[PDB]
Write a protein that binds this ligand. Structure first.
Ligand SMILES: [Zn+2]
Length: 78
């Protein structure tokens, strides 16, 4: 259901314009938008990450936060 990138990106409906990190970048990293702030949450491991900054890596932060997530370890790559 959220295994496809595009379905995740449809959660970024009201995502703060001018977030240092874009909704695409975050959708690619496996993240859904919570609808609050710039707070997102990974669809597989359910970890949330907010407070995005210039030069952040969506993938990097996601791994840092949850290094054993099924998605970022490629277990969803079709
Ligand atoms: Zn995850």
């Amino acid at each position: 259901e959220f295994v496809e990138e595009f379905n995740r990106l449809k959660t970024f409906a009201n995502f703060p314009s001018g977030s240092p990190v874009s909704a695409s970048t975050l959708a690619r990293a496996g993240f859904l938008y919570t609808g609050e702030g710039d707070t997102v949450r990974c669809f597989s491991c359910h970890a949330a990450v907010d407070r995005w900054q210039y030069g952040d890596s969506a993938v990097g932060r996601h791994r840092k936060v949850s290094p054993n997530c099924r998605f970022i370890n490629g277990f969803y790559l079709e």
